[PDB]
Amino acid sequence: LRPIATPYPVKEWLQPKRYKAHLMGTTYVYDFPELFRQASSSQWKNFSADVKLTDDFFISNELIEDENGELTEVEREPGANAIGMVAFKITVKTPEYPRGRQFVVVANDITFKIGSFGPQEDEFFNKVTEYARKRGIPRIYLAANSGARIGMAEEIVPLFQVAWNDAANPDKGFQYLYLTSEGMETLKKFDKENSVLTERTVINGEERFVIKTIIGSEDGLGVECLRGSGLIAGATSRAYHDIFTITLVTCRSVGIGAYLVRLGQRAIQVEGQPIILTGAPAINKMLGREVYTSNLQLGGTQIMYNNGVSHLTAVDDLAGVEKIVEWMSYVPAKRNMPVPILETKDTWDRPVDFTPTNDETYDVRWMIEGRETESGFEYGLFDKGSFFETLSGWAKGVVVGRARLGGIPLGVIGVETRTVENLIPADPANPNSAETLIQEPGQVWHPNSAFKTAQAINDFNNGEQLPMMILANWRGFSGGQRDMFNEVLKYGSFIVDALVDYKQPIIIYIPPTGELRGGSWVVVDPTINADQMEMYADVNARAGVLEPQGMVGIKFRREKLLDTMNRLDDKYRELRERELLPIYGQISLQFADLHDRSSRMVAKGVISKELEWTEARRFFFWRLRRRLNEEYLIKRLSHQVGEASRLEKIARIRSWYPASVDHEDDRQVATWIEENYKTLDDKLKGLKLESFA
């Protein structure tokens, strides 16, 4: 017992497994729930400093398999786990779910055979994943492991005999390995005959049983661990599409552990805790040479956060847990429940302060969440303090996160107008290599940023089930050699696919200093998913196929200007100057630019409305809210009557509005619906009068 004379019991002595975990620089698995209690309690504090919280706000029940392999809740001593995988069901009252929401936490035990995945761990992880999926609820995975479990048949180590070519000269080889009759008998003795596959051949003297295959009595040595690995890889692929999935990397995550991190998509990596496939010793031992000094060179945050495998980093375990709790605060309590409304003091009903100018450089984040000034806070488009940026280490020409809009949680995607200096480090395996600077111009989709954009749309849709706003402001894709070689069209096309799959409302909005040209517009037009998408342009946006320089280059050429210098008298009167080129070219540029305006977009039927930035918060608040309400009714009509298109479903529902409701007044439509949900419900129950063959 050490230290002595402490005020309360030494928890690291009561259960030495807790000391072991600490010695490995991670939280002991059975203490994680307390981190979730601490994190959940900080959420309430940050939401409402004066709320009275008791311990009944938060409950963690460990899940174990009963005798039939069915998951049950138990309360027991930390460290009684007979497998190296453990899980808890948490029921917590949160600001978004003040009567409670649930989720599972599954976690390796790094103290149990080094957190290795053997068959039983893989089976339990899989049962836990299905438990959550069946229930609709989020699955949090706390990754701390050494990959698949390995081993030899240790019983065979002291028994085997090597059949030498030349007995007293071992030097020039052996023929095979074998068992004597006392080997065979020692095995039969312990009921381990199964451990080995033998071919009998008596060579001169005696019977030698030849080892043809070593099997082993002990489960968890090889391919059976690989089978379980793939089971939980597929289980996690599937869960991503089904529930909110997230992982926290808190000691090494290795092999299957690294795959699990990526497969669950959403990942938070504690600094200094690597995500690796193979360790540096093994890699080095295979290159002869000592290329690598640290597993952090292969999968630290400087690899994975810079990659987009790690969506965030965290300074320690609690911080990562708080980032999880925070990320969940935007997400339905379970699959297909409504997105959690959270109204804060920043209420919908205000103008938007921070307005960008073409003159001046800006951080797009100011437009999103607003900006601190010396004259005080300039409010952005979304609720103050509500912006939770993710994938912030990678592809920095796009900005992604969650935010709230008068309380409505949504995915947000914006464009970074500033040039990214993407510094790529040298490969220590290549002595030739130097660190490389890639400069990434703003408003320009590169392969990284296109990949990030599609990834974001997918991660908003799947599990999060969030509506979305894209603050679209791209000049196009980089069509140069390097970017085209590096497969920009592939990543770009993923954006289309992502939109086609989207199941919640989407708003595309070209902001006040913004543009959408050419390739850019293709990938984001609402006809890609008319059921869910709408587009809007700020009165101070531009759009069309080419920029003005581009358009004049093709349709206001050197000879068309000249004809236009019959707006001049000096030139007019010279038939039977030409250093007004400077300004006649500016005139052509301006003539092109006059096509590229929101008024043209409206005229042409390509946007639902032109907008005013300062008024955009109010507009979108009621638009989005009206959309959520109508989607809810489309869904009810769909759980019921059966076969009709979206267009017939929305027209039936809208035929139910009072004749004086203006179908195009968002606030009115939302208001009427919310006053009459239960009356509508009555109507829907009547429509379940369905002899439909």
Nearer to ligand B38, 283 or 457 (CB): 283
- Buried b / exposed e along 291-320 (16+ C-beta atoms within 10 A): bbeebbbbbbbebbbbbbbbbbbbebbbbb
Least separation in angstroms between residue 599's CB and its own copies is: 4
The residue ranges that bind ligand B38 (CB under 6 A) are 278, 282-283, 285-286, 441, 444, 475-476, 478-480, 517-518, 546-547, 549-550, 553
> If we measure between CA atoms, which residue out of 510, 536, 543, 538 comes closest to residue 624?
536
Phi, psi values for residue 503, rounded to 5°? -115, 0
Site for its own copies in 548-587 (CB under 8 A): 549-551, 553-556, 560, 563-564, 567-568, 580, 582-584, 586-587
- 618 is an annotated ligand-binding site residue: no
Q: How far apart are CA 577 and CA 565, in angstroms?
A: 9
Nearer to its own copies, 14 or 163 (CB): 163
Partner interacting with residue 441 (select from ligand B38, its own copies, none; CB below 5-8 Å by kind): ligand B38
Partner interacting with residue 429 (select from its own copies, ligand B38, none; CB below 5-8 Å by kind): its own copies
User: What character string, x for contact with its own copies (CB under 8 A) and - otherwise, covers 298-337?
Assistant: xx---x--xxxx----------------------------
Least separation in angstroms between residue 286's CB and ligand B38 is: 4
Least separation in angstroms between residue 469's CB and its own copies is: 18
Nearer to ligand B38, 447 or 476 (CB): 476
Q: Give CA separation, 49 vs 38, 43, 53, 164, in Å.
A: 15, 10, 10, 79
3-class SS at 584?
helix
- 438 is an annotated ligand-binding site residue: no
Quick check: 289 binds its own copies (CB under 8 A)? Answer: no
How far separated are the first and last CA of the chain, in Å rounded?
Answer: 76
Distance of CA 366 to the CA centre of its chain: 23
- 371 is an annotated ligand-binding site residue: no
Angle, helices 616-638 vs 666-687, to 10°: value is 10
Site for its own copies in 481-500 (CB under 8 A): 481-482, 484-485, 487-490, 492-493, 496-497, 499-500
Least separation in angstroms between residue 686's CB and its own copies is: 20
Nearer to its own copies, 308 or 406 (CB): 308
- 172 is an annotated ligand-binding site residue: no
Which of 132, 397, 519, 631 is close enough to bind its own copies by CB under 8 A? 519
Nearer to its own copies, 90 or 298 (CB): 298
Helix ranges (H only) for 479-527 are 481-485, 488-501, 518-522
- 252 is an annotated ligand-binding site residue: yes
Residue nearest to ligand B38 (CB): 550
Least separation in angstroms between residue 98's CB and its own copies is: 37
Dump the DSSP string for 642-676.
----HHHHHHHHHTTS-TTS-TT-HHHHHHHHHHH
Which of 428, 531, 609, 683 is close enough to bind its own copies by CB under 8 A? 428
- 567 is an annotated ligand-binding site residue: no
Q: Give CA separation, 592 vs 216, 347, 549, 595, in Å.
A: 78, 41, 8, 6
Q: How far apart are CA 682 and CA 677, in angstroms?
A: 9
Nearer to ligand B38, 281 or 351 (CB): 281
> If we measure between CA atoms, which residue out of 515, 542, 344, 538 comes closest to residue 443?
515
Partner interacting with residue 444 (select from ligand B38, its own copies, none; CB below 5-8 Å by kind): ligand B38
Site for its own copies in 406-425 (CB under 8 A): 424-425
Q: Under a CB-based contact definition with an 8 Å cutoff, are residues 461 and 410 in contact? A: no
Question: Which positions ≥6 away from 470 have C-beta within 8 Å?
Answer: 412, 413, 414, 506, 507, 508, 509, 524
Binding-site residue ranges: 148-150, 252, 519, 555, 557
